[PDB]
Amino acid sequence: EPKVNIINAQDDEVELMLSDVNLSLANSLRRTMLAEVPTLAIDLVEIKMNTSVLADEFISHRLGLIPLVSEDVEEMKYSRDCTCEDYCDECSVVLELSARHEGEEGTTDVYSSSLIKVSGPGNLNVGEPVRRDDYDQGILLCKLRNHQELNIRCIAKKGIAKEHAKWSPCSAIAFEYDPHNKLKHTDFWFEVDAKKEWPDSKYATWEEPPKPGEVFDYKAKPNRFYMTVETTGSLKANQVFSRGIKTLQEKLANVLFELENSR
Amino acid sequence: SALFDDIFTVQTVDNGRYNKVSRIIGISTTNSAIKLTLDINNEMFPVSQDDSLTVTLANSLSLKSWRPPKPTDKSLADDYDYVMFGTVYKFEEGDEDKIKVYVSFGGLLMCLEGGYKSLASLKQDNLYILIRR
Amino acid sequence: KMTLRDTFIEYEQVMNMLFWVPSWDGVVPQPAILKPKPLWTGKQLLSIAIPSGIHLQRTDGGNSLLSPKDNGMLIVDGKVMFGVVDKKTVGSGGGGLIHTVMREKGPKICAELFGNIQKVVNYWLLHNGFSIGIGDAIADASTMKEITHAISSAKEQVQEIIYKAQHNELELKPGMTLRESFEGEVSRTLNDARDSAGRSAEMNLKDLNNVKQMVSAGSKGSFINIAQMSACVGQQMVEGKRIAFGFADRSLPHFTKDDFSPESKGFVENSYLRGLTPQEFFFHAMAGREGLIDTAVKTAETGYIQRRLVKALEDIMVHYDGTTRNSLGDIIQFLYGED
Amino acid sequence: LMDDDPVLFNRQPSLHKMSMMAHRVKVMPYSTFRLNLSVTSPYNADFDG
Amino acid sequence: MNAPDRFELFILPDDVPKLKITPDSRVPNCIIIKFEREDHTLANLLREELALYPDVTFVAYKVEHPLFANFVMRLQTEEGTRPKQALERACASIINKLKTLDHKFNEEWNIKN
Amino acid sequence: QKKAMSSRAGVSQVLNRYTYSSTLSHLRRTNTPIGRDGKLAKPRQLHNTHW
Amino acid sequence: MIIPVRCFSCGKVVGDKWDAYLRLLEEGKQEGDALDELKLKRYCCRRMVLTHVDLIEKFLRYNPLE
Amino acid sequence: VPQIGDKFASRHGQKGTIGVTYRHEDMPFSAEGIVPDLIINPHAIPSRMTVAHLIECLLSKVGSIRGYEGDATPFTDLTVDAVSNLLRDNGYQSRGFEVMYNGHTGKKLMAQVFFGPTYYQRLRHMVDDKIHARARGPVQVLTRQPVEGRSRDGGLRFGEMERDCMIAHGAAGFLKERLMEASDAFRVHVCGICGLMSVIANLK
Amino acid sequence: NLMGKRVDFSARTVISGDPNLELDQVGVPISIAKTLSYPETVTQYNIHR
Amino acid sequence: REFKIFTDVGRVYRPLFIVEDDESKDNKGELRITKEHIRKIQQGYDDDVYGWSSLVTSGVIEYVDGEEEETIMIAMTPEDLQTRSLNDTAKRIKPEMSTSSHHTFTHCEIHPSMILGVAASIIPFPDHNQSPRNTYQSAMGKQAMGVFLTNYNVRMDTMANILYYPQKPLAKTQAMEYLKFRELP
RNA sequence: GUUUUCGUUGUUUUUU
Ligand SMILES: [Mg+2]
Ligand SMILES: [Zn+2]
Ligand SMILES: [Zn+2]
Ligand SMILES: [Zn+2]
């Protein structure tokens, strides 16, 4: 019964048309992709020696915010689920950084390229920092002056947007339906008139423009729901969507589990 | 359980400040001097001026935590178009032949003013009002 | 926004607030609307949060029994018959619902009803929401021009009073000297200007307008507030006076000597929407600093007043006899409040 | 100090005797005093610090 | 220096359970279900799913406090089905809906790009 | 210091560097050292000449 | 100083655009079209780059102890 | 880092503390799924009446969409209506309203929310610098009473009006222990003839 | 020092709004509810707790 | 029947644009300073230096005190310099000029927005909000968090506060440009 | 070693 007609697709941005679903279910899925989809982000930073002019908390928190290419973050075990003392590779990808400036007058631009993935449990390709792309030399991390050094090691562990926006698989997810307010969910507040003061959505062409004669059916419920999902490069749109679906499935499965567990 | 039965021709309607409800005032087709004023959700069952509506005042619709309305419980309501539940809040035992029964249906006010005995049986607490077109 | 006649709620939201309502008996009553679809009204939701055994009845503005405006007030045993509950009843007003629970049920029941209404309102607004916008604060151009012409007419009346005073044609008011009569009557005229403009703006406030909805809700704001924001601020009255000519026979070097016209003496010709001219901006600065200095000064004297009054009567107590006496036993009054 | 512990409740200034009120402690996180909206009005105070 | 922690929003303490059902004799065939480590995401979904169930006579939930990732849901069903059983039915129904969602999404994603 | 009495206090104060303006504006004050000997509003009230 | 790694209002990868943004600035170019070239679609992401104030260049032009 | 209770202010006198912090998923989103960084009380506008704040937010939206620095110099010729027209040109509602969708349900909130950027400022006052509890600490050398000052574990100075209100409250034992156990309390041995503390005293 | 003097078991902190809280309760920080305490005498009923 | 000259220390002066007050030319009711002087200043030098003292000593701008101000009549904006001879709800108001058909303003401020202060030059449209709130803004502006100095690190101060990410305001004044608020926001 | 030890004058600025 769940029906989708994907308008457009891309590595990060996707516009989908999920029809024949519940509004509450659709919102729950949107929340799951926004917060409960796991990614990899730096959660521990050691500064071995630093001669820059910036705080180490600054650079550490920024490093945490950096998305890491995380198509396989599911295989990574949690720092609390994994039984090992301290960190092992299976629950922790190690990153490294070492940069210097020597040219006196000048500045060495430390980029996320300098963040070198020096671990990652074979294979489990998680931990390499996301960038715009290859020609882009990476996310800029620091600016080095005469005789200034950044030497850092990093521990990245599996995480979600719910515990930090640095693990957030998405920036924002657009969720829409009823592109003409034919279901009467918003007032069209107005100073002169309601239909003309309020524009027509990009999905106005998709569903029918409401018949002026047609009296509102007080039993119809929202059925066609438009979705727009974007990722930061740590994951892909399809990955985030599927992970959210499966995560809410396993949430319901555990709810079952505890239901018959209590009885 | 259909204590009172009548049909009314609607003479006036006004929404005013309220948009989803209009107060409607009509005279009874069956017998004049029987005036019916009722606040109605317009978009849910619309009526207009001079509209003839089949009004029934019932003491009991069952022929208590309200449940999703089960079709297994038949209602005289199903015989009508707009059905509205309320409480008779004043039985106006006034004029010689003008009982003015005021019933509040959760806020929607109704005045049935007319015959003394024709409305005397309406000396109840709650009320079901049932409307065919 | 809730008690209104055309407020409609559906089974799911109903049941959700019922679970939210602390004073719900697990039993939802029959919805007022049942067919062709069961729908619920604001009054029944109110009565759900209300524990039974509370009746109230107040005719409002001489309203009738059929209450077309949903005005008036009638709660029966915790069930609202007609009338929208307002701050005149849910606030601290005497005879109010809180007064009623004080004098019928006690303080615990009032604490319960506070929680009831607070949580159900949290739900209902969380799900609806109510806001404010610039379009709410603006009225159509017709009322804007009514405002403009009201101010202009008041200015013309001011100029007429100026001419009468400047040629002694102004008839002397009782206990009010000629120049001061001029100043005071012009003050009255310009306050009438601001109030007329404001009342026009209030009239042009619309139903969806969250501004009139704010004042009618009464959560904050008032008439004069809208008058100043939308129509015009009006004369900056300091300690019940008018902004005088601070310089030599002038209030600003941009005005002239004996510039009896309003702009040179502190009457605001703009609203908070429009923004104010530098001269009258400085005049509103006059009024604002006046208010702040009034507060700051009044602090210390009101304080020592309070302290000395507390010192004055620190031991008056009604003894078990019922007579009000001193520590000496000399009776001030044989009974408390004569009763 | 547990939850529901009655404690004297005081604001400066305190003009009326209704400015002294006995509230039940509800041990809950954050370093502020969490209150009802209605009880703030007699205090004529706000949460601007 | 007093604010609560963040991992507890989903991590179950030993003493309290994920699911604590108590009988709601307030109306027949009703219970009160305490879901720790939960919020609106699952709560509203299960609420709507149960509301779609004809047996379910009362369905509601409330996040008693937003400063705690938890909620409690009151569920009454008809005299035939038990509230708990209606809950497993709702969970399994949403399971199958999610399966269909993921399948259709994946298929049209593949055919799309 | 011997004539501690009848001495004006506050003409020199520690420069604030909480913010940059905490210096700049701090360097462009004026003061009227009359004292609250007689409260009055004239030393505190804005005047048209202050325009 | 220093553009945020992640967009405060939204959360988009934005950090690796500053040098590109300056490149776009150099050719006497309008601001908004350049930001659009930088894939800055959400005006939150747009003013985050538009109104960011980097300050390390004065800090770095200080001769450090080492 | 900000926390519940932290003090902040606008450029329009709009000052307040944090009441609660909510995550992305629970707060409503726009049609494009955009949530605000911060939420304020509407009740300020009827009371505090900051029109310039509205103009600032409008110009902020316009500038962020158009990507330039907006001017707000006082005593200039700018008109709000033109800015609304440009916002129409920006493909956005002229009065800045936009439908939010309840974060908990995704349902279109009935009103269209005025939603956009504003320039705000952090303020020196925090919450955790005033949190201070004292059951027993250092006492002043002379008074033998709890010291004053949050630096040195200061006690709450009980004002005289608080005493008076407690007296009107019938708080005899409470105020007594506030002055007996919570304050200075020494026992001495006085004479019954002269009635003075003129007694060499030795308990042991 | 006599009509005004400091007390112990007293705390002073920020106030915040709690719409879901009861009127006669104040949301007390764990710091305040911990540092501040009441002396409960050991009785036969409270011995366990 | 008096006259008075003051050169004592402490009398404060503001530079007023010199509207020709001697009625002998069309510049009477206009500014001696013109777009020629503006262009010369825009050069930063003189076309054979034109500094600020150049404008002051050229007689097109002069210093004025309050005691002088109460004896002079000043134009607010460049609009009312020449004595003038519809229905817009987004504009301010100049003197009506109904009986006083003529006005020979001896001067005009460089900008009415210069009646403000250093802090006041920060607020976006401080003229659309209540004066008490303007005063509260002024008071709170000095205690608002920000970034004070570039070499905060080399200073050993009782308290130092530096923002992670200073941001230039979307809403700006023009005196802002002079305040360099883009550089220390 | 249970236990266990800081303060004031004056000055400025502040805080609903
Ligand atoms: Mg206070
Ligand atoms: Zn491990
Ligand atoms: Zn953004
Ligand atoms: Zn003796």
UniProtKB/TrEMBL annotation, chain A:
Name of the protein in question: DNA-directed RNA polymerase II subunit RPB3
| Residues noted as binding Zn(2+) 2 in the record, renumbered to the chain | C82, C84, C88, C91
Q: Name one Pfam family in it.
A: RNA_pol_A_bac
Q: How does it assemble?
A: Component of the RNA polymerase II (Pol II) complex consisting of 12 subunits.
Please list the residues that bind Zn(2+) 5.
C88, E90
**Binding sites annotated in the UniProt record for Zn(2+) 3:** C82, E90, C91
The record's listing under InterPro entries reads: DNA-dir_RNA_pol_30-40kDasu_CS, DNA-dir_RNA_pol_insert, DNA-dir_RNA_pol_RpoA/D/Rpb3, RBP11-like, RNAP_Rpo3/Rpb3/RPAC1, RNApol_insert_sf, Rpo3/RPB3_RNA_Pol_subunit
Q: Where in the cell is it found?
A: Nucleus
Identify the residues that the record assigns to the DNA-directed RNA polymerase RpoA/D/Rpb3-type domain, covering every copy. Answer: 13-258
| Tagged with keyword Nucleus | yes
* Residues reported to bind Zn(2+) 4: C82, C91
* GO BP: termination of RNA polymerase II transcription; transcription elongation by RNA polymerase II; transcription initiation at RNA polymerase II promoter
- HAMAP family in the record: RNApol_arch_Rpo3 (MF_00320)
The UniProt keyword set, sorted, is: DNA-directed RNA polymerase, Metal-binding, Nucleus, Transcription, Zinc
Query: Domain of life of the organism in this record?
Result: Eukaryota
Cellular component annotations (GO), alphabetically ordered: RNA polymerase II, core complex
Q: Name one GO molecular function term.
A: protein dimerization activity
Ligand binding (Zn(2+) 1): S79, C84, C91
The family classification in the record reads: Belongs to the archaeal Rpo3/eukaryotic RPB3 RNA polymerase subunit family.
UniProt binding sites for Zn(2+) 6: C88, C91
What species is given as this protein's source?
Komagataella phaffii (strain GS115 / ATCC 20864)
TrEMBL record, chain B:
GO terms, biological process = termination of RNA polymerase I transcription; termination of RNA polymerase III transcription; transcription elongation by RNA polymerase I; transcription elongation by RNA polymerase II; transcription initiation at RNA polymerase I promoter; transcription initiation at RNA polymerase II promoter; transcription initiation at RNA polymerase III promoter; tRNA transcription by RNA polymerase III
| A cellular-component GO term for this protein | RNA polymerase II, core complex
GO MF terms, alphabetically ordered: DNA-directed RNA polymerase activity; RNA-directed RNA polymerase activity
Q: What is its main location?
A: nucleus
Alphabetical UniProt keywords: Nucleus
Q: Where in the cell is it found?
A: Nucleus
Q: PANTHER family, from UniProt?
A: DNA-DIRECTED RNA POLYMERASES I, II, AND III SUBUNIT RPABC3 (PTHR10917)
Family note: Belongs to the eukaryotic RPB8 RNA polymerase subunit family.
Q: What does this protein do?
A: DNA-dependent RNA polymerase catalyzes the transcription of DNA into RNA using the four ribonucleoside triphosphates as substrates. Common component of RNA polymerases I, II and III which synthesize ribosomal RNA precursors, mRNA precursors and many functional non-coding RNAs, and small RNAs, such as 5S rRNA and tRNAs, respectively.
**What is the protein name stated in its UniProt record?**
DNA-directed RNA polymerases I, II, and III subunit RPABC3
Automatic annotation (TrEMBL), chain G:
Instruction: List the InterPro entries hit by this protein, alphabetically.
Output: RNA_pol_su_RPB10, RNA_pol_suN_Zn-BS, RPABC5/Rpb10
Signal peptide per UniProt? none
- What is its subcellular localisation? Nucleus
Keywords, in A-Z order: DNA-directed RNA polymerase, Metal-binding, Transcription, Zinc
List, in alphabetical order, the Gene Ontology terms for molecular function in this entry.
DNA binding; DNA-directed RNA polymerase activity; zinc ion binding
What Pfam families is this protein classified in?
RNA_pol_N (PF01194)
Chain positions recorded as Zn(2+) binding sites: C7, C10, C44, C45
Gene3D superfamilies documented for this protein: Homeodomain-like
An example GO biological process term is: transcription by RNA polymerase I
Report the principal subcellular site.
nucleus
One Gene Ontology cellular component annotation?
RNA polymerase II, core complex
Write out the similarity annotation. Answer: Belongs to the archaeal Rpo10/eukaryotic RPB10 RNA polymerase subunit family.
Spell out the PANTHER family in the cross-references.
DNA-DIRECTED RNA POLYMERASES I, II, AND III SUBUNIT RPABC5, DNA-DIRECTED RNA POLYMERASES I, II, AND III SUBUNIT RPABC5 FAMILY MEMBER
Q: Please report the name of this protein according to its UniProt entry.
A: DNA-directed RNA polymerases I, II, and III subunit RPABC5
From TrEMBL, chain H:
Q: Where is Zn(2+) 1 bound in this sequence?
A: C191, C194
Q: Where does Zn(2+) 2 bind?
A: C194
How far does the signal peptide extend, from start to end residue? none
Query: Where is it located?
Result: Nucleus
The subunit field of the Swiss-Prot or TrEMBL record says:
Component of the RNA polymerase II (Pol II) complex consisting of 12 subunits.
The UniProt family comment states:
Belongs to the RNA polymerase beta chain family.
**Task of the protein:** DNA-dependent RNA polymerase catalyzes the transcription of DNA into RNA using the four ribonucleoside triphosphates as substrates.
Q: State the name under which the record lists this protein.
A: DNA-directed RNA polymerase subunit beta
